[PDB]
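Q: I'm a student working through a structural biology exercise. My instructor gave each of us a protein and asked us to get a predicted structure, then write a short paragraph describing it. Mine is Major prion protein. I'm not confident about reading structure output yet, so if you can add a plain explanation after the tokens, that would really help. Here is the sequence I was given:
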Amino acid sequence: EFSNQNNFV
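A: Happy to help. First, here is the predicted structure for Major prion protein. I'll explain a few features afterward.
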């Protein structure tokens, strides 16, 4: 299981 989230501002 691979869970990934990224934010770029």
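A: Here are two points you could use in your paragraph. The chain has no helices and no strands. Residues 1 and 8 are 24 Å apart (CA to CA). It's a good idea to check both against the output above yourself.
Q: Great, thank you!
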